[PDB]
């Protein structure tokens, strides 16, 4: 009886005020923690680097006064999203910049982590591994093992709609034809 | 490694977010909810407290009840963790005989009541049958030599009926039948070490195969223990009805162990110290739809004023209906199996009411029907359903309804002949229609009634492949139907129950006459 | 670090004293030290407690279950916070009673849980039969049931219990005494035996208003007639018209709370009657008949200098215990409960209490209390009385009557008058203490007639189902609509509050209501009817 009530207490007694403003510094810095190091090298040799704004993220310097077509954006899950409600956005141009919106509960929760790790890996194949067209052959002999296999709904969790009508396996040719398709698995 | 204040198995971040446990080939693991790959799948979308090691706080853990290690008798509905599962017991008479210290022997029809104020305690309601099994039977007072100093004796056979959503295992309620609004005639006994038998939701006991429990013992524990003196008997005869108020004193608890997945019966925990907490930090709804019985069923909902209380998902009336009745969404609209939620009433208690008047407020509504998904339930609210197409007594029980209504269900006639009709009725709407009135009608506008006398309506018996076939000769003189007129007018007139008389008039009149009748049959003599 | 923590109550020891304050963040609650800028916008509370006390009230609930919600949900909301005790208060109520003899007088009772002074730790309740004539033709009881000297009465009364505290009792229900008189103890009502196995919320009933009320004789075969009471016996309640109800203190078991999977189980080692001296030495008592003139009592943990672990409990002003217990807010930083103001009220001390604030008062160099509120200290076992100033009490601090100003105020509203009655709406409150009406009707030159001219016929007041008052001439009258000699007579009505009314028929059994003093309440001419 008297073990139990140290973890309970634990959890919930935050000694210690970090305060207003630090908490948010705080979220942002342990969440890029967990990708590794070697990637945000990558990143920076290629050029711009992420900062990260605390407002609307629909009304900043770097990102207003470009694609403001683009406002339909879609999340990891495929629904449709408005971008003044969105939370974290990306964008691919001679200045690869990428934009996080702080917050404090990265931590806590999860399906906000798991788009800003979404966007991390969007940036890497479109715009990294793109200088040398590393996808290849060995990322396509693993994806054509996916689409034949026995009722393997992993199909449903990583293909869109248009790929699960191809009917034979993929092909050299259509990666190059189609590489947005591709880089988003 | 993942934290998890509440110990219950799931972690914490899964708690909060929703979740769903999937079978893979044969091993069963617990997933994040994935919006495309999970729902294609028919899997359902569960949410909880973590800080509850019962969200719903009935005696199964969050983790426990969704992946199925738990009495497998608990309905399936109540496996979702946000609907409390606890019992629900009530008693059915079924028929009841009376003699004197010459035997009245009726049959007995019982509903489970709700009454307005309206409070946490189970009660039922018997119906006795008012129609004349024998002719030459008028005045129990003297078919039973019952005189101003006698006294009369009641037995009775009952059973019952579990309608909540989980088992009671050793003790059975105690329940006391009361007569008018304070006689109590009798205390049921609790009988001793004798249910050792189950009750599972939506069962009987003792089973429709066995004889029903004879109320009085048989035995020498009183030579007629419902003794009643002549003042009872006569309030009686002008009520012809009971109630039978029943406790929430059940027994211990079936809970499931870990070490080798048995089933046992903890002596420690006992349901009487449970249903106190779901009493107090659920809302309450009431639902008529299934078959015009009185379904209850409770939905765990936050309570602004305690901290731990907020810890519980928030709770769109919308959304309680989906997932503690079966409503669902073909296409986007609010239907139970077709009929669309816009054919039911809303009513609330003042509180409630209160409650919900300001939730219209802030969204500039006044049909509930629309802004119905952006209603939050908080805790305490009690929610009454009804369906608006049947009219109700003072106990909340259907009793009636419009005319027209009636008419459509009986405008299909399989067939027609000079000994009855054979009808095929929706099932619902046999359960306030107390008789029919037959009559023939001469070329000149007369009206003969066959049946005319008050307590000689029930005539209309139900075959065996669900058609309604009317018996003429029932309580005719066994003889077939006569007319006089081959261009003479046949009607037919049905009587509901709230619309029927139960005792002799003031000059003790037996006609039908001062009774409001509706026309349902009126063809012609040479068609029949 | 190894935060410090003697008291062994979850909370660390820095945080008790200064003040802290459990918060939800989005789905998860946490503990958190009070920020003075931060926190008060959000409308949260600042908790305050003892290093060294697992439960500074000392009832069983710990300092960090009240404040965090894992506990009985039924512990009342004003009971969570840490410095007000939670236990039962459990009293009887009687609703109404039947007489006969070894032809049965039934009246109606009325019921209202008692106070009186050198007031004491124990619950008591007083009962009050109705003396009004149900019947016209029944004057003088002791006729109307055949009593004669050397006979016997039997009574059959109808009960219910009453919970008017903070927490619930579980499965034993108190044994209680009748008494009769100063000392003539009728009989005592058994305790059942293993049938009150359901719980008593608070501020609930047992049975429910819904099932029947459990009778008090058994009906069964344990005595012909428990309550026997000779001849003499009679003769006093025929004056008197008064039963005391006195109850004990032997409740149940306590409902405790499991961290190991949060089911609430009653511990059959822990029993209310062992608890209950401690908060009965420890706490300082209020009496408040604020809401609905009924008395709600509270207990709020304060300082004892003469012990060291007392000392350790936070200082408690006056000012706060108000707010924090009973629901006292400052919408202009002025004291006040629902619009009145808190100088509305009356203070009274025990001599000992009295005598301490005296002190209290000496040191601040003040003489009203009403100002320096916030400057008063609480010591263990003072006890407070804070009773409405504007109704009259009798001995026992029941609501009796009033000044004659308020009376008339409360009726300047007349929504209707006809020649079949009035059609009022008054603040509930007030008829509590008005016990019925005089009607007169007023010749143009001065003269007086009473309808309803004898001292048991004044029950002419029903209420509506809408909670407006209607008065009935026909019902007291001869079922005939009302009368009038003259559209330009006055018709005058007054009423009788409780404490002005007389309850039997006087030395030579005048019924006439002459030397009772009325006071005026309507006077419009016949034509303005």
Same mark, same amino acid.
């Given at each position: 009886?008297?073990?139990?009530?140290?973890?309970?207490?634990?959890?919930?007694?935050?000694?210690?005020?970090?305060?207003?403003?630090?908490?948010?510094?705080?979220?942002?810095?342990?969440?890029?923690?967990?990708?590794?190091?070697?990637?945000?090298?990558?990143?920076?040799?290629?050029?711009?680097?992420?900062?990260?704004?605390?407002?609307?993220?629909?009304?900043?310097?770097?990102?207003?006064?470009?694609?403001?077509?683009?406002?339909?954006?879609?999340?990891?899950?495929?629904?449709?999203?408005?971008?003044?409600?969105?939370?974290?956005?990306?964008?691919?141009?001679?200045?690869?910049?990428?934009?996080?919106?702080?917050?404090?509960?990265?931590?806590?929760?999860?399906?906000?982590?798991?788009?800003?790790?979404?966007?991390?890996?969007?940036?890497?194949?479109?715009?990294?591994?793109?200088?040398?067209?590393?996808?290849?052959?060995?990322?396509?002999?693993?994806?054509?093992?996916?689409?034949?296999?026995?009722?393997?709904?992993?199909?449903?969790?990583?293909?869109?709609?248009?790929?699960?009508?191809?009917?034979?396996?993929?092909?050299?040719?259509?990666?190059?034809?189609?590489?947005?398709?591709?880089?988003?698995? | 490694?993942?934290?998890?204040?509440?110990?219950?198995?799931?972690?914490?971040?899964?708690?909060?977010?929703?979740?769903?446990?999937?079978?893979?080939?044969?091993?069963?693991?617990?997933?994040?909810?994935?919006?495309?790959?999970?729902?294609?799948?028919?899997?359902?979308?569960?949410?909880?407290?973590?800080?509850?090691?019962?969200?719903?706080?009935?005696?199964?853990?969050?983790?426990?009840?969704?992946?199925?290690?738990?009495?497998?008798?608990?309905?399936?509905?109540?496996?979702?963790?946000?609907?409390?599962?606890?019992?629900?017991?009530?008693?059915?008479?079924?028929?009841?005989?009376?003699?004197?210290?010459?035997?009245?022997?009726?049959?007995?029809?019982?509903?489970?009541?709700?009454?307005?104020?309206?409070?946490?305690?189970?009660?039922?309601?018997?119906?006795?049958?008012?129609?004349?099994?024998?002719?030459?039977?008028?005045?129990?007072?003297?078919?039973?030599?019952?005189?101003?100093?006698?006294?009369?004796?009641?037995?009775?056979?009952?059973?019952?009926?579990?309608?909540?959503?989980?088992?009671?295992?050793?003790?059975?309620?105690? +329940?006391?039948?009361?007569?008018?609004? =304070? @006689?109590? &005639?009798?205390?049921? $006994?609790? *009988?001793?070490?004798? /249910?050792?038998?189950?009750?599972?939701?939506?069962?009987?006991?003792?089973?429709?195969?066995?004889?029903?429990?004879?109320?009085?013992?048989?035995?020498?524990?009183?030579? +007629?223990?419902?003794?009643?003196?002549? =003042? @009872?008997? &006569?309030?009686?005869? $002008?009520? *012809?009805?009971?109630? /039978?108020?029943?406790?929430?004193?059940?027994?211990?608890?079936?809970?499931?162990?870990?070490?080798?997945?048995?089933?046992?019966?903890?002596?420690?925990?006992?349901?009487?110290?449970?249903?106190?907490?779901?009493?107090?930090?659920?809302?309450?709804?009431?639902?008529?739809?299934?078959?015009?019985?009185?379904?209850?069923?409770?939905?765990?909902?936050?309570?602004?004023?305690?901290?731990?209380?907020?810890?519980?998902?928030?709770?769109?009336?919308?959304?309680?209906?989906?997932?503690?009745?079966?409503?669902?969404?073909?296409?986007?609209?609010?239907?139970?199996?077709?009929?669309?939620?816009?054919?039911?009433?809303?009513?609330?208690?003042?509180?409630?009411?209160?409650?919900?008047?300001?939730?219209?407020?802030?969204?500039?509504?006044?049909?509930?029907?629309?802004?119905?998904?952006?209603?939050?339930?908080?805790?305490?609210?009690?929610?009454?359903?009804?369906?608006?197409?049947?009219?109700?007594?003072?106990?909340?029980?259907?009793?009636?309804?419009?005319?027209?209504?009636?008419?459509?269900?009986?405008?299909?006639?399989?067939?027609?002949?000079?000994?009855?009709?054979?009808?095929?009725?929706?099932?619902?709407?046999?359960?306030?229609?107390?008789?029919?009135?037959?009559?023939?009608?001469?070329?000149?506008?007369?009206?003969?009634?066959?049946?005319?006398?008050?307590?000689?309506?029930?005539?209309?018996?139900?075959?065996?492949?669900?058609?309604?076939?009317?018996?003429?000769?029932?309580?005719?003189?066994?003889?077939?139907?006569?007319?006089?007129?081959?261009?003479?007018?046949?009607?037919?007139?049905?009587?509901?129950?709230?619309?029927?008389?139960?005792?002799?008039?003031?000059?003790?009149?037996?006609?039908?006459?001062?009774?409001?009748?509706?026309?349902?049959?009126?063809?012609?003599?040479?068609?029949?």
């Amino acid at each position: 009886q008297e073990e139990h009530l140290k973890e309970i207490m634990k959890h919930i007694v935050k000694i210690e005020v970090k305060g207003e403003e630090a908490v948010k510094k705080e979220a942002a810095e342990k969440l890029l923690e967990k990708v590794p190091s070697d990637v945000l090298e990558m990143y920076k040799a290629i050029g711009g680097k992420i900062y990260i704004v605390d407002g609307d993220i629909t009304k900043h310097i770097s990102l207003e006064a470009l694609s403001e077509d683009k406002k339909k954006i879609k999340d990891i899950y495929g629904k449709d999203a408005l971008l003044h409600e969105h939370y974290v956005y990306a964008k691919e141009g001679y200045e690869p910049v990428l934009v996080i919106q702080s917050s404090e509960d990265y931590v806590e929760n999860t399906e906000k982590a798991l788009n800003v790790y979404y966007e991390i890996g969007k940036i890497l194949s479109r715009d990294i591994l793109s200088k040398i067209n590393q996808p290849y052959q060995k990322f396509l002999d693993v994806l054509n093992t996916i689409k034949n296999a026995s009722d393997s709904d992993g199909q449903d969790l990583l293909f869109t709609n248009q790929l699960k009508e191809h009917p034979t396996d993929f092909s050299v040719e259509f990666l190059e034809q189609n590489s947005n398709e591709v880089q988003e698995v | 490694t993942v934290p998890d204040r509440d110990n219950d198995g799931i972690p914490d971040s899964l708690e909060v977010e929703g979740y769903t446990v999937d079978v893979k080939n044969k091993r069963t693991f617990l997933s994040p909810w994935i919006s495309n790959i999970h729902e294609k799948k028919g899997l359902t979308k569960y949410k909880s407290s973590p800080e509850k090691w019962s969200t719903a706080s009935d005696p199964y853990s969050d983790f426990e009840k969704v992946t199925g290690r738990i009495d497998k008798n608990v309905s399936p509905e109540a496996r979702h963790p946000l609907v409390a599962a606890y019992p629900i017991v009530h008693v059915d008479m079924e028929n009841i005989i009376l003699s004197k210290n010459r035997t009245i022997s009726k049959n007995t029809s019982t509903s489970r009541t709700h009454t307005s104020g309206f409070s946490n305690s189970n009660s039922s309601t018997v119906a006795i049958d008012h129609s004349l099994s024998l002719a030459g039977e008028r005045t129990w007072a003297e078919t039973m030599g019952l005189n101003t100093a006698d006294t009369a004796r009641l037995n009775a056979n009952i059973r019952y009926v579990n309608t909540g959503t989980a088992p009671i295992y050793n003790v059975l309620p105690t +329940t006391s039948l009361v007569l008018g609004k =304070n @006689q109590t &005639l009798a205390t049921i $006994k609790a *009988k001793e070490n004798q /249910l050792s038998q189950i009750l599972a939701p939506n069962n009987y006991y003792p089973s429709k195969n066995l004889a029903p429990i004879a109320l009085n013992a048989q035995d020498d524990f009183s030579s +007629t223990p419902i003794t009643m003196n002549y =003042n @009872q008997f &006569l309030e009686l005869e $002008k009520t *012809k009805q009971l109630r /039978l108020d029943t406790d929430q004193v059940y027994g211990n608890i079936a809970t499931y162990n870990f070490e080798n997945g048995r089933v046992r019966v903890d002596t420690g925990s006992n349901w009487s110290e449970v249903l106190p907490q779901i009493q107090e930090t659920t809302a309450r709804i009431i639902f008529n739809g299934k078959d015009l019985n009185l379904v209850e069923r409770r939905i765990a909902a936050v309570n602004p004023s305690d901290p731990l209380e907020t810890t519980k998902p928030d709770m769109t009336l919308k959304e309680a209906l989906k997932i503690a009745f079966g409503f669902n969404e073909p296409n986007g609209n609010l239907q139970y199996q077709g009929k669309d939620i816009t054919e039911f009433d809303f009513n609330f208690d003042q509180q409630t009411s209160q409650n919900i008047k300001n939730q219209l407020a802030e969204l500039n509504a006044t049909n509930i029907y629309t802004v119905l998904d952006k209603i939050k339930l908080n805790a305490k609210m009690n929610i009454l359903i009804r369906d608006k197409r049947f009219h109700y007594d003072r106990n909340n029980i259907a009793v009636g309804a419009d005319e027209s209504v009636v008419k459509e269900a009986h405008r299909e006639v399989i067939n027609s002949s000079t000994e009855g009709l054979l009808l095929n009725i929706d099932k619902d709407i046999r359960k306030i229609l107390s008789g029919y009135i037959v009559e023939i009608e001469d070329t000149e506008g007369l009206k003969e009634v066959i049946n005319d006398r008050y307590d000689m309506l029930n005539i209309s018996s139900l075959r065996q492949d669900g058609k309604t076939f009317i018996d003429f000769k029932k309580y005719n003189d066994k003889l077939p139907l006569y007319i006089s007129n081959p261009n003479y007018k046949v009607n037919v007139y049905a009587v509901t129950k709230e619309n029927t008389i139960i005792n002799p008039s003031e000059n003790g009149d037996t006609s039908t006459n001062g009774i409001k009748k509706i026309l349902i049959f009126s063809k012609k003599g040479y068609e029949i």
